[PDB]
């Protein structure tokens, strides 16, 4: 059966699309305001050298911090998100931050050269830039695999916004209080998405593929958390980060 989207489901989709349009700049026009990218000689991808310099860390920390601010703004517009306690809203934001950043980075990701192209050559990011921020291949290899698999789904904007909202409103995050209310908000979003796909997505298992991307995000989140811990041991690393990054990942 292919039930039609309800008036409420149409309203939810319109709300999420508007929220995304207000919180995502597809021209990357604020990027010149971040601390500048610095790319030094590291053809060998030396862990010792990367940790010694962390040349791309100030720029990428400013990028992630900016992205987290946008995610906070988007989440506030998710129907039902405001119905949660302020404590649950924060737990959900902090626990999903890196996964939602990964999902939103997909819009600038291009399979032309496997880079995140955000304007000029200064704002063109590759695997090499992430290693220059002190990350290792255990995170980068699955991260690129994820970006390509997600890109190949050719998601409609409606599906992309629902996916981010479902990611944020997850009842299975550690420390949440009202898991049942979080689950009812997520179910309302998940049903909207399932109905949308059957009703609007032409042929040529998309919902199952999108669910699998959410599980892939969980693994990437865990690996990112391990790597952030290593990075946090580097003397003077805090100056290269931001207060928001320090709170979210600390």
Q: Which residues are annotated as a binding site for calcitriol?
A: 24, 67, 104, 108, 135, 224
Q: Is 5 or 231 the residue whose CB approaches ligand DS3 more closely? A: 231
- Sign of the alpha-carbon torsion through 165, 170, 175, 177: positive
**Shortest gap between Cβ of 88 and ligand DS3 (angstroms)?**
22
Tokens of 49: 């050298």
For residue 115, the minimal CB distance to ligand DS3 (Å) is 9
166: nearest Cα among 141, 138, 197, 200: 197
CB of 6 to ligand DS3, least distance (A): 29
Task: Pick the closer one to ligand DS3 by CB: 142 or 171.
Answer: 142
User: Which alpha helices (DSSP H) does the chain contain, by range?
Assistant: 7-23, 47-53, 57-76, 86-105, 127-131, 137-151, 157-168, 179-200, 206-232, 237-240, 243-249
When the beta carbons of 9 and 70 are compared against ligand DS3, the nearer one is: 70
Cα-based angle 15, 72, 249 (whole degrees, multiple of 5): 145
Please state whether the peptide bond connecting residue 103 to the residue before it is cis, i.e. omega within 30 degrees of 0.
Answer: no
* Least Cβ distance, residue 198 to ligand DS3 (angstroms): 29
> Judged by CB, which is closer to ligand DS3: 196, or 249?
249
CB of 68 to ligand DS3, least distance (A): 8
Q: Which is nearer to ligand DS3, 70 or 213 (CB)?
A: 70
Q: Which is nearer to ligand DS3, 64 or 91 (CB)?
A: 64
SS3 79: coil
Residues annotated within a binding site: 24, 67, 104, 108, 135, 224
Name the strand (E) or helix (H) holding 125: strand 124-125
Closest approach of ligand DS3 to the CB of residue 30, in Å: 8
Q: Which residue is closest to ligand DS3 by CB?
A: 67
Helix 157-168 to helix 7-23 angle (10° resolution) is 90
CB-neighbour burial class of residue 161 (10 A; exposed 0-12, middle 13-18, buried 19+): buried
d(CA 90, CA 178): 13
Residues that bind ligand DS3 (CB under 6 A): 24, 60-61, 63-64, 66-67, 70, 101-102, 104-105, 108, 116, 118, 125, 129-130, 133, 135, 228, 231, 245, 249
């Amino acid at each position: 059966l292919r039930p039609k989207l309800s008036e409420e489901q149409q309203r939810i989709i319109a709300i999420l699309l508007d929220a995304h349009h207000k919180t995502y700049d597809p021209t990357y026009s604020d990027f010149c305001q971040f601390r500048p990218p610095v790319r030094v000689n590291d053809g060998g991808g030396s862990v010792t050298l990367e940790l010694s310099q962390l040349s791309m860390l100030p720029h990428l920390a400013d990028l992630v911090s900016y992205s987290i601010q946008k995610v906070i703004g988007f989440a506030k517009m998710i129907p039902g998100f405001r119905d949660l306690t302020s404590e649950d809203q924060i737990v959900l934001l902090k626990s999903s931050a890196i996964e939602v950043i990964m999902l939103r980075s997909n819009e600038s990701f291009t399979m032309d050269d496997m880079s995140w192209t955000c304007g000029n050559q200064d704002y063109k990011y590759r695997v090499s830039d992430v290693t220059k921020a002190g990350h290792s291949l255990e995170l980068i290899e699955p991260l690129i695999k994820f970006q390509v698999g997600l890109k190949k789904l050719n998601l409609h904007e409606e599906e992309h916004v629902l996916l981010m909202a479902i990611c944020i409103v997850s009842p299975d995050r550690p420390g949440v209080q009202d898991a049942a209310l979080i689950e009812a908000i997520q179910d309302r979003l998940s049903n909207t998405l399932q109905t949308y796909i059957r009703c609007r997505h032409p042929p040529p298992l998309l919902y199952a593929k999108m669910i699998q991307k959410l599980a892939d995000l969980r693994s990437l989140n865990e690996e990112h958390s391990k790597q952030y811990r290593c990075l946090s041991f580097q003397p003077e690393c805090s100056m290269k980060l931001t207060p928001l990054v320090l709170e979210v990942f600390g």
